[PDB]
Design a protein around this ligand. Sequence first.
Ligand SMILES: CCCCCC[C@@H]1NC[C@@H](O)[C@H](O)[C@H]1C(=O)O
Ligand SMILES: CCCCCC[C@@H]1NC[C@@H](O)[C@H](O)[C@H]1C(=O)O
Lengths: 597, 587
Amino acid sequence: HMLRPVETPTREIKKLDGLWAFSLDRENCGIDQRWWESALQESRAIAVPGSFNDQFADADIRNYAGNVWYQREVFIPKGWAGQRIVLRFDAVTHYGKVWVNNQEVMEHQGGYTPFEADVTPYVIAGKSVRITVCVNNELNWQTIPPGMVITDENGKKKQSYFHDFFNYAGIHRSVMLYTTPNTWVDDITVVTHVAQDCNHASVDWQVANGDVSVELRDADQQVVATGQGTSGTLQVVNPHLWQPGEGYLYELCVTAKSQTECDIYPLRVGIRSVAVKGEQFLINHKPFYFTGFGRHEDADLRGKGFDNVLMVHDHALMDWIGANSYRTSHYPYAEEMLDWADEHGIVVIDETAAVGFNLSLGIGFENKPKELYSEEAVNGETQQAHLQAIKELIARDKNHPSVVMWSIANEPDTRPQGAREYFAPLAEATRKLDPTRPITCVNVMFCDAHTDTISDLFDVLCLNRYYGWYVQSGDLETAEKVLEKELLAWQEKLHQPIIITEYGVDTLAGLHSMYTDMWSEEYQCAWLDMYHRVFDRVSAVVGEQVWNFADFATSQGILRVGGNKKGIFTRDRKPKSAAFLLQKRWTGMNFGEKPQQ
Amino acid sequence: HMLRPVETPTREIKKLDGLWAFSLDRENCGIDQRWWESALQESRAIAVPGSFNDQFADADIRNYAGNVWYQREVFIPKGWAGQRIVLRFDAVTHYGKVWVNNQEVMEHQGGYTPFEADVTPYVIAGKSVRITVCVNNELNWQTIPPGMVITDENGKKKQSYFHDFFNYAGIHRSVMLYTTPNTWVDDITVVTHVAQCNHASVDWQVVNGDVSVELRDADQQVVATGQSGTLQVVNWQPGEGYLYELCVTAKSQTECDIYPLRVGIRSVAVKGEQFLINHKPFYFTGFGRHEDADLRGKGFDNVLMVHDHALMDWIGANSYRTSHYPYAEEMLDWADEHGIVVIDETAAVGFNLSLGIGFKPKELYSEEAVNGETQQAHLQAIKELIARDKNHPSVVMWSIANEPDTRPQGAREYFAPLAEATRKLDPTRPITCVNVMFCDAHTDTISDLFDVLCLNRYYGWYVQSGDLETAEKVLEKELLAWQEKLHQPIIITEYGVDTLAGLHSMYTDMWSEEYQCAWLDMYHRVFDRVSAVVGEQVWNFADFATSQGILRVGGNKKGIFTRDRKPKSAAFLLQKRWTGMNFGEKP
Ligand SMILES: CCCCCC[C@@H]1NC[C@@H](O)[C@H](O)[C@H]1C(=O)O
Ligand SMILES: CCCCCC[C@@H]1NC[C@@H](O)[C@H](O)[C@H]1C(=O)O
């Protein structure tokens, strides 16, 4: 049971603020020598939140595999003698184990979701405790995402993985201590139903030794509904709906009264209905059309570290270009992202970190498990770890009205028997963990309409298609034919709504061509344009998401010229020519509505 | 039998004055309708020499597969009534058929060598004859280099091939008309020997005329003289490059003809781990190159040659390999005449089906692919190279092919006749065949049919990508493995990494100028530790155009220079090494 921290009977002191002591451990003696005991040797200042790889311009820190130590002292605020205090890590990429002054208090696997522990017994209010963090950036076959650690003859660990983006690690987001009353709200769940768009209710179901009443206050803070019951309610309402263009928010505030002290938790709600009918995706009983991007949490110097200016600027760009939706590509994003999405009515495809369950999308000319689904590779523990990743993503983003669909994985290889054996239970478990949202699994190119094995276990079909790029390279005529043929094949086979969640081409900013050859800005424009002409001719396609909003870092190889260049913007957010192409189509269309051509 | 035209009793008018009428033939009725009848209509100006693909900024012309039509008139000069006059094409890339006013005067297959024909019976001096050329850019398994044409559903041709560089086509070189006296020399052959202050120069000046030969100096003052066959004693070095001149007089009583031909006195041979030029241990330094440049494609251009040679001289290169095809004959005149060491190579590239991109005949040596006809065309291509560059002193080694796959059974049947035959087509030059990375020491089948073996190695790039410590270990161990395994001299004909000009990194990540620098330095330190290898040639001198794909960012970016000839940081690195060593002597 987890909620995002906020105010009044609750209060934060964040240690996000500032520089920590940081150290490597090339021989992994930190645990043996109990480094959490003393203040570190060999410590250098590092900034949190932020990846550790790019911060020191050193290829050895950058390419490190192992454990790293983050440590900082802090003064525990003194008006906190009688309240309950928690230590919350909003993300520690891959694995983290924390000591609060010689006392292990938490441990976590999963680099993208928050994890907290009550630390009341282990701290002296009014004085300073020392926080030590042990961070592991290693991936094996039971981590979400999977990878393999390669140890050379000399014990240097080098991490290989099967996804594009670079394996940035560290404390990527918020680290804070926050206090709730000893009687406190611990979890909230809100569900919205709507009929003729002027007439429904907000079911609730709450959970910590406190009798609870909930007021549903206005944007004007005018109250229009009231309930009581730990097992919640159905507050019935005639309302203004949370819509894609505007995203209205009521405020449902839950009051947890114990007979002495009280706690109250403010939770914003968007009144909207999501469903799939035939080949139509409907938000509030109207067929929506998705436009926008796959994104990444990547940026210069800070890696995957959260940054407010970046969020403000990237939403300004996305707003300008006319995007209405995005997918949290290949891991759960910072919650600040989803909060922004709620206030602005941005439609979001929420996705777990389950990427790389595929051993066919390689560079060439170089020792893998020859069976993807097996005891050596993706096995039962992997499945359990995956289900737990689904449970953490859902427990954190269930109430967000902007999250409109759950993505279980991205681009697994579905051809082997055992893909369906691995995925079907996860598809079912996910539906039972949130029956109010449709479910998806993003589908790779070579698992075509004929060969794919699991897409009928999901509500929406999300395709990643690169005809004319990785195959039929340079050939816009042939690729157009292939793309039309496979889209009609998919619509014939499943009669589900189709979103093209990935389509894009590597483009060097400033490379121009009078031909329309690959890597050129002219080719990025003509290729996106040919895709758009096809989408507009297939009734089932309800959504387009250009593969990347910006250029991002990847591991080194012959396929990646300083990373992935499929961005519409450069890594410093400057637009390639295709940006204006996109802006013309996406602002020239009626909002949320499929282009009539 | 071939040699370059010159002017003392013979005379040229080049039709290289570029603007010819040019046209495509997209429904392939040109041969049927005999377009050579009339002047081509629906015609647009084109520049000759130059590839036709890039001249028009048109992607449909650029990617065309089929026949194209080149046509121009010329006024044959009237002081040409009694001499024999020849129509000479220095190269028509892939295939060419010429009409001189309906009389189809020639044909040629093989896009990198000249072909000439006497057109006296079909020409009237003092008026203009209509020249029509049909050039085909298509490749099959029986062509040099090999390829496959696949036709899509609508009769649209796509040409696929297996070499990196782009398949540029057209009239790439000189087109000249030249007139000789009716008793004329047709071929010359010269061989030079040298001992450890003195030696001889065989000749055989195959012509209808008696023979007298003058050996005039740079002063053109005489040093030996003969009268078919000789063997003359005397009493050409890399840094300096001296050239004597033998002048051939075909003396007839009816008329006379003379030919001036330059000669270089030097000896080349190998054994142990040593390649010796005039009995001295050489070290090759320099480049794999390409005939590629903006707008003109593979078209020859004098400014380009002057500038690129300034660059190679500055950076400290003493040698280059005519990568994947025979270069401009003018290239070799410059190299003879400037003392550049040239590793000469034919167009035998793409005999390999193993490292293409990701995302075909199932056995390379067989009738479906590499067959007996391929053997013939390959032998003929080897022999045309031999006939045109036999007299050039700058050629120091002949390359029979580049980067074939040696692992399938049958490579040694295809190859053995070509190595024996080619050694038998000139014992005065050593022979090599450049072998790919994946045919390593244990796996390669044929490295012993050649005098030197030349390695193209890219460890740290295509394998162990970015892993420069590990790549170092591999390069050292398999280099020593090769030295033990054949005890031949080794030249590294290819080593380089794609480098985007202006991409810089505080790490040393691939595609960065820092990475090119660090990678080349590691390779260089590796060679300094193997007594055996006597030659280093950084893979490409300049960035060049290739066919489109996910591996090539607007072409191959392994150049030391960009395509507009601007230096990456590694350029200076190379200059330091090649200027910092004593000439021809490796650290
Ligand atoms: C042949 C299949 C190619 C799949 C390649 C498409 C990949 N999908 C997942 C994304 O994270 C990658 O960046 C994208 C790519 O490589 O740019
Ligand atoms: C595994 C790759 C094997 C090396 C192949 C490297 C290629 N040699 C032949 C040249 O024509 C190519 O330019 C070179 C390359 O990279 O552009």
